[PDB]
């Protein structure tokens, strides 16, 4: 459950992330694939090399999903219904992988926004990504 | 922990530039802030209510210095991590009762702190190598 | 996130539990302390032997909280606010302990209601206890 | 796994009354039902949509028999779990990529199945002994 303060912090942090969302998401996916190779088993039709256009496109989709989740933070379960069904009913992704991707997103945000990534902002983004992962992993 | 020569060289080169005095305290304070239930083990460190009070705590800074010293001692003995962290594992398991998940959380926070401090110099391969070293320290402590 | 189906299953299962809630909670607390003695550190002022009056009373309190949570499944964060501020703010309980207590409650319910503990009911109760633990481990 | 003589005697006596064909299959079916992401691994087995289809699967029953046979082999070598479960650990990690948390989940489901099948005879000390045995099997498999 999120408070108002960390919700405002997450909104401000993502608003300052802005237009670099596609590159940030592609880098987060690359970091997850490189440091957690077991997650590569969920992408058998992909070209998981560095600088791949397919990985860049998937990162763009992931970033757009995170952006609309930021825009609809108060009502996540029904704003992410399509993604939650694809992740849970079709893909059946282990929530450990969601934790791994959240950690890699945090690492990417830390590496690309030093001034933005304060300890409070870190906590707010951690629990925002935790809420997103819980919504996507829930089966309902 | 098995590392490639490139990963070992990159890890050593990046750890050579790490400011211990600040990085240890940063990692410990961010652990206490992001995962507040960890303050149960550090309730004796004084004021830990707000993030500004957690990050500006001399006891937190000193303990983070000790934690980074232990991490460096482990990094110097990557092939004997289980034997290096025997006393620390006994201390954390028998006297302090710290759950093994907390070590993984602290390692992830340390990796985030390293990324924050080094920016673009913290490439995904360096992050992967540091992830495996952090996992090895956590598994050695959980033993 | 819970569906209507598991909400109905949980409500029926706990209504059938009924008046044995105090004994079931006392047994769940006893099982957890023996199985995972690390959880005993949260109760340093208790008498943690078998048949202890303090343990039986705390089991009664836990069972009453669970019954109230069943009665208020759709507004759990606003129903268990006092307990949320107790465990997260002051006790600072690790959510691993919540997972262990949920598992021990499931074991007690399995051992006391064979006919009631069908595989669907097991999934429903698991998700309900996970929701309760998530509510109690959050900060507002 | 370190156990008292009383704990080992209690574990062995409960195991003798265990119906393997039912217990293994029921534990695997309850795993697949309660934790639906585990069906990614078992997609080959067949229809696994409803709980009635998961529980009424001959492939699930046979695989549960195999799993409980491995559990019995681990019980027969409780002081050599790591060496007993080395081939299975390699099979699950290198070829199947099963996350180690899933072994813990399956062990907990097996404990719940034992409690369900043995009722009041599943005392808290017996559960504690079985929890430790299940943790040892899971740690040996995750190695
Ligand atoms: C944590 C936040 C996540 C978000 C916001 C997210 C979002 C998305 C989006 C927007 C898509 C595109 C769906 C489409 O284009 O139809 C997608 C697909 C997919 N996601 Fe995620 N995802 C997340 C986590 C994960 C993780 C951790 C994994 C696996 C380790 C994963 C596995 C997949 C797979 C396999 C696809 C299919 C892609 C394809 O078939 O091309 N997702 N996700
Ligand atoms: C994961 C890697 C970790 C390393 C390398 C590490 C290192 C150390 C070291 C070297 C000490 C000795 C301090 C002394 O002798 O004065 C220590 C003590 C301690 N550790 Fe850790 N630690 C780790 C994880 C954790 C975590 C995650 C927690 C809590 C959530 C924790 C809780 C403590 C506590 C409470 C003490 C005693 C502090 C005191 O008594 O003032 N440790 N640790
Ligand atoms: C579903 C899970 C849980 C529920 C519904 C629950 C419910 C309750 C209730 C009703 C109380 C009584 C509050 C009062 O008397 O003022 C309480 C207190 C307490 N709880 Fe929990 N609890 C849960 C899990 C846990 C766990 C897993 C732990 C520790 C491992 C824990 C630690 C405590 C402690 C230390 C107290 C204080 C008791 C006292 O001061 O006498 N709780 N909880
Ligand atoms: C203590 C935990 C476990 C034990 C003792 C165990 C034991 C076994 C055994 C005996 C086999 C047969 C291997 C063979 O015949 O060559 C097997 C295979 C397998 N296991 Fe496990 N297992 C455990 C947990 C899990 C879990 C939790 C999953 C998935 C979530 C899993 C997935 C599989 C799969 C997919 C196979 C191959 C099935 C097939 O080839 O048809 N295992 N395991």
PDB file of C-alpha atoms in Angstrom, chain B residues 8-101:
ATOM      1  CA  UNK B   8      37.694  -9.593 -12.034  1.00  0.00           C
ATOM      2  CA  UNK B   9      39.728  -6.737 -13.514  1.00  0.00           C
ATOM      3  CA  UNK B  10      36.656  -4.504 -13.869  1.00  0.00           C
ATOM      4  CA  UNK B  11      35.492  -5.258 -10.317  1.00  0.00           C
ATOM      5  CA  UNK B  12      38.942  -4.570  -8.847  1.00  0.00           C
ATOM      6  CA  UNK B  13      39.334  -1.358 -10.864  1.00  0.00           C
ATOM      7  CA  UNK B  14      35.922  -0.055  -9.799  1.00  0.00           C
ATOM      8  CA  UNK B  15      36.392  -1.034  -6.144  1.00  0.00           C
ATOM      9  CA  UNK B  16      39.729   0.781  -6.150  1.00  0.00           C
ATOM     10  CA  UNK B  17      37.878   4.075  -6.671  1.00  0.00           C
ATOM     11  CA  UNK B  18      35.187   3.430  -4.028  1.00  0.00           C
ATOM     12  CA  UNK B  19      35.095   5.941  -1.173  1.00  0.00           C
ATOM     13  CA  UNK B  20      34.546   3.545   1.731  1.00  0.00           C
ATOM     14  CA  UNK B  21      33.682   6.177   4.350  1.00  0.00           C
ATOM     15  CA  UNK B  22      30.703   7.440   2.330  1.00  0.00           C
ATOM     16  CA  UNK B  23      29.632   4.304   0.446  1.00  0.00           C
ATOM     17  CA  UNK B  24      29.252   2.094   3.517  1.00  0.00           C
ATOM     18  CA  UNK B  25      27.107   4.630   5.318  1.00  0.00           C
ATOM     19  CA  UNK B  26      25.088   5.304   2.167  1.00  0.00           C
ATOM     20  CA  UNK B  27      24.315   1.603   1.723  1.00  0.00           C
ATOM     21  CA  UNK B  28      23.399   1.057   5.381  1.00  0.00           C
ATOM     22  CA  UNK B  29      21.210   4.160   5.549  1.00  0.00           C
ATOM     23  CA  UNK B  30      19.428   3.297   2.316  1.00  0.00           C
ATOM     24  CA  UNK B  31      18.782  -0.199   3.664  1.00  0.00           C
ATOM     25  CA  UNK B  32      17.304   1.262   6.856  1.00  0.00           C
ATOM     26  CA  UNK B  33      15.179   3.726   4.855  1.00  0.00           C
ATOM     27  CA  UNK B  34      13.883   1.516   2.021  1.00  0.00           C
ATOM     28  CA  UNK B  35      13.353  -1.532   4.299  1.00  0.00           C
ATOM     29  CA  UNK B  36      12.295   0.007   7.628  1.00  0.00           C
ATOM     30  CA  UNK B  37      11.892  -3.318   9.453  1.00  0.00           C
ATOM     31  CA  UNK B  38      15.699  -3.532   9.463  1.00  0.00           C
ATOM     32  CA  UNK B  39      15.702  -0.746  12.070  1.00  0.00           C
ATOM     33  CA  UNK B  40      14.711  -3.394  14.624  1.00  0.00           C
ATOM     34  CA  UNK B  41      18.344  -4.554  14.604  1.00  0.00           C
ATOM     35  CA  UNK B  42      19.747  -0.997  14.853  1.00  0.00           C
ATOM     36  CA  UNK B  43      17.308   0.560  17.347  1.00  0.00           C
ATOM     37  CA  UNK B  44      20.409   1.311  19.467  1.00  0.00           C
ATOM     38  CA  UNK B  45      21.795   3.708  16.825  1.00  0.00           C
ATOM     39  CA  UNK B  46      19.637   6.594  18.057  1.00  0.00           C
ATOM     40  CA  UNK B  47      17.351   8.663  15.847  1.00  0.00           C
ATOM     41  CA  UNK B  48      16.258   6.643  12.802  1.00  0.00           C
ATOM     42  CA  UNK B  49      12.837   8.161  12.086  1.00  0.00           C
ATOM     43  CA  UNK B  50      13.291  10.328   8.987  1.00  0.00           C
ATOM     44  CA  UNK B  51      15.583   9.613   6.021  1.00  0.00           C
ATOM     45  CA  UNK B  52      17.523  12.794   6.834  1.00  0.00           C
ATOM     46  CA  UNK B  53      18.129  11.483  10.370  1.00  0.00           C
ATOM     47  CA  UNK B  54      19.070   7.997   9.158  1.00  0.00           C
ATOM     48  CA  UNK B  55      21.562   9.245   6.565  1.00  0.00           C
ATOM     49  CA  UNK B  56      23.199  11.712   8.963  1.00  0.00           C
ATOM     50  CA  UNK B  57      23.855   9.275  11.811  1.00  0.00           C
ATOM     51  CA  UNK B  58      27.506   8.804  12.894  1.00  0.00           C
ATOM     52  CA  UNK B  59      26.740   5.322  14.242  1.00  0.00           C
ATOM     53  CA  UNK B  60      25.202   4.378  10.887  1.00  0.00           C
ATOM     54  CA  UNK B  61      28.286   5.772   9.135  1.00  0.00           C
ATOM     55  CA  UNK B  62      30.678   3.786  11.347  1.00  0.00           C
ATOM     56  CA  UNK B  63      28.693   0.569  10.954  1.00  0.00           C
ATOM     57  CA  UNK B  64      28.602   1.062   7.186  1.00  0.00           C
ATOM     58  CA  UNK B  65      32.368   1.519   7.273  1.00  0.00           C
ATOM     59  CA  UNK B  66      32.614  -1.834   9.062  1.00  0.00           C
ATOM     60  CA  UNK B  67      30.255  -3.462   6.541  1.00  0.00           C
ATOM     61  CA  UNK B  68      32.313  -2.181   3.604  1.00  0.00           C
ATOM     62  CA  UNK B  69      35.488  -3.396   5.301  1.00  0.00           C
ATOM     63  CA  UNK B  70      33.924  -6.852   5.510  1.00  0.00           C
ATOM     64  CA  UNK B  71      32.853  -6.630   1.856  1.00  0.00           C
ATOM     65  CA  UNK B  72      36.398  -5.691   0.816  1.00  0.00           C
ATOM     66  CA  UNK B  73      37.818  -8.554   2.885  1.00  0.00           C
ATOM     67  CA  UNK B  74      35.457 -10.899   1.048  1.00  0.00           C
ATOM     68  CA  UNK B  75      36.332  -9.368  -2.333  1.00  0.00           C
ATOM     69  CA  UNK B  76      39.995 -10.110  -1.585  1.00  0.00           C
ATOM     70  CA  UNK B  77      39.119 -13.777  -0.882  1.00  0.00           C
ATOM     71  CA  UNK B  78      36.527 -14.550  -3.565  1.00  0.00           C
ATOM     72  CA  UNK B  79      37.670 -18.195  -3.668  1.00  0.00           C
ATOM     73  CA  UNK B  80      37.254 -18.622   0.117  1.00  0.00           C
ATOM     74  CA  UNK B  81      34.100 -16.625   0.855  1.00  0.00           C
ATOM     75  CA  UNK B  82      32.580 -19.383   3.005  1.00  0.00           C
ATOM     76  CA  UNK B  83      35.648 -19.527   5.250  1.00  0.00           C
ATOM     77  CA  UNK B  84      36.122 -15.757   5.322  1.00  0.00           C
ATOM     78  CA  UNK B  85      32.604 -15.047   6.642  1.00  0.00           C
ATOM     79  CA  UNK B  86      32.396 -17.856   9.216  1.00  0.00           C
ATOM     80  CA  UNK B  87      32.576 -15.614  12.294  1.00  0.00           C
ATOM     81  CA  UNK B  88      30.208 -13.056  10.758  1.00  0.00           C
ATOM     82  CA  UNK B  89      27.721 -15.764   9.763  1.00  0.00           C
ATOM     83  CA  UNK B  90      27.801 -17.181  13.296  1.00  0.00           C
ATOM     84  CA  UNK B  91      27.324 -13.682  14.742  1.00  0.00           C
ATOM     85  CA  UNK B  92      24.367 -12.899  12.473  1.00  0.00           C
ATOM     86  CA  UNK B  93      22.697 -16.321  12.807  1.00  0.00           C
ATOM     87  CA  UNK B  94      23.084 -17.174  16.500  1.00  0.00           C
ATOM     88  CA  UNK B  95      23.251 -13.865  18.376  1.00  0.00           C
ATOM     89  CA  UNK B  96      21.451 -11.365  16.113  1.00  0.00           C
ATOM     90  CA  UNK B  97      18.920 -13.623  14.308  1.00  0.00           C
ATOM     91  CA  UNK B  98      19.101 -11.742  11.000  1.00  0.00           C
ATOM     92  CA  UNK B  99      17.125 -13.394   8.210  1.00  0.00           C
ATOM     93  CA  UNK B 100      19.160 -14.380   5.117  1.00  0.00           C
ATOM     94  CA  UNK B 101      16.899 -12.291   2.850  1.00  0.00           C
TER      95      UNK B 101
END
